[PDB]
Subunit: 82 residues, 2 copies
């Protein structure tokens, strides 16, 4: 839906405002009732530690869920991006 | 509607993140089709100039409309608040 594209835009913008995010590589969002469940991959510095990449991913989870209240499940993984 | 309260929450938060805003005193939002038309009053420093208060109001108009894409009309006035 178009309202869905509005939501996906908000998710991408929210994630890209988090320190350490090198773009959103992938985002799949779906409605479960009125709730959004979503899975996303962010880009990170290949020289970040795995621990740092996990910290960024968690920061993205908190930022995105803080800004888009209809999200009730959000998984964030990371991949190296230059 | 409840989705309307979500929109009003987003409007208030967006406005209160603008430098110079001393809360949202009043916000009336209504749907015109799928678009939001809204009228709001912000609080400002009573010692700001009228020109400064107009600048803050314009900054609020741009910030709110930038964050909530469904808004197609937004009027922002200001009043002194301590």
């Amino acid at each position: 839906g178009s309202h869905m594209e509005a939501v996906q835009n908000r998710i991408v913008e929210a994630a890209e405002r988090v320190p350490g995010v090198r773009g959103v590589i992938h985002l799949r969002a779906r409605y479960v009732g009125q709730d959004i469940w979503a899975d996303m991959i962010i880009g990170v510095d290949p020289e970040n530690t795995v621990e740092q990449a996990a910290e960024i991913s968690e920061a993205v989870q908190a930022a995105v869920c803080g800004k888009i209240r209809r999200i009730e499940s959000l998984h964030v993984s990371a991949a190296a991006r230059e």
